[PDB]
Amino acid sequence: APKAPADGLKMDKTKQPVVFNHSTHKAVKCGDCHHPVNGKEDYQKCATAGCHDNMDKKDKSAKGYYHAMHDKGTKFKSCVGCHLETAGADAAKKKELTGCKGSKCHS
Numbered sequence: 001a002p003k004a005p006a007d008g009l010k011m012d013k014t015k016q017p018v019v020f021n022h023s024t025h026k027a028v029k030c031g032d033c034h035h036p037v038n039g040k041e042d043y044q045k046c047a048t049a050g051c052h053d054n055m056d057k058k059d060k061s062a063k064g065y066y067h068a069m070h071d072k073g074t075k076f077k078s079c080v081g082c083h084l085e086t087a088g089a090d091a092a093k094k095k096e097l098t099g100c101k102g103s104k105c106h107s
């Protein structure tokens with residue numbers, strides 16, 4: 001099975017780039033993020049053609065890149081979706097982990 005890459009990975013499909021560190025997400029199963037497609041876990045970049053390649057941040061289809069990173073009620077938990085649950089009622093953690101600005105995701 002594929003190995004986790006180094007920390008400091010930059011997601012930069014957009015003008016609001018975010019750094020992702022695998023080391024802080026070890027408690028999450030690889031396949032929770034690199035989820036099954038056609039029955040097999042897919043480790044291709046999220047925005048690969050035919051995947052989440054729609055850079056229209058309003059799109060909520062299975063192709064919406066912004067959607068897969070931010071929204072709730074999705075088949076696999078998104079960045080913000082999981083972080084919301086992690087922060088719970090903790091407003092400082094809400095700011096750190098789900099804030100739209102001044103957070104660990106967006107400066």
Ligand code: HEM
Nearest residue numbers: 002003004005011020025028029030033043044045046047
């Ligand atoms: C868990 C053990 C685990 C593995 C294995 C793994 C692998 C992996 C690879 C090989 C990449 C590089 C992709 C490329 O070709 O550039 C990669 C990238 C990302 N990962 Fe990962 N990963 C594992 C676990 C997790 C977990 C727990 C999450 C989510 C909570 C996660 C997320 C990401 C993200 C985001 C990327 C960047 C991909 C992009 O298109 O920007 N990984 N991982």
Ligand code: HEM
Nearest residue numbers: 033037042044045046050051052062068074075076077078
């Ligand atoms: C890469 C790390 C990556 C992320 C992040 C990601 C997330 C994601 C979410 C949050 C959903 C749910 C959306 C919803 O509204 O329910 C979701 C769904 C699908 N994805 Fe994905 N995904 C990542 C990677 C990839 C790759 C590499 C592809 C294409 C090969 C891909 C495709 C899809 C498709 C299609 C779905 C729907 C699957 C289903 O069972 O309905 N994703 N993704």
Ligand code: HEM
Nearest residue numbers: 018019020021024025028069077078079082083086104105
């Ligand atoms: C999805 C692409 C995604 C991003 C981006 C992301 C980022 C992120 C950061 C920047 C941190 C803080 C630590 C660091 O700098 O590495 C952080 C921390 C936690 N996360 Fe996350 N994260 C994304 C996705 C997910 C998903 C899908 C989950 C859970 C299913 C998850 C969980 C966590 C947890 C737990 C932490 C640590 C909590 C803390 O208080 O530090 N993330 N993430």
Ligand code: HEM
Nearest residue numbers: 011012013014016017018057069079080097098099100105
């Ligand atoms: C909070 C509600 C919040 C907002 C709003 C927000 C906005 C935002 C924008 C405008 C983009 C760029 C979209 C485009 O295509 O122009 C963007 C991109 C990413 N985000 Fe975000 N964002 C909010 C919060 C968070 C949080 C808390 C995280 C991480 C846990 C996060 C992550 C990401 C990721 C990943 C991207 C894509 C980065 C890239 O590929 O360039 N956002 N966000």
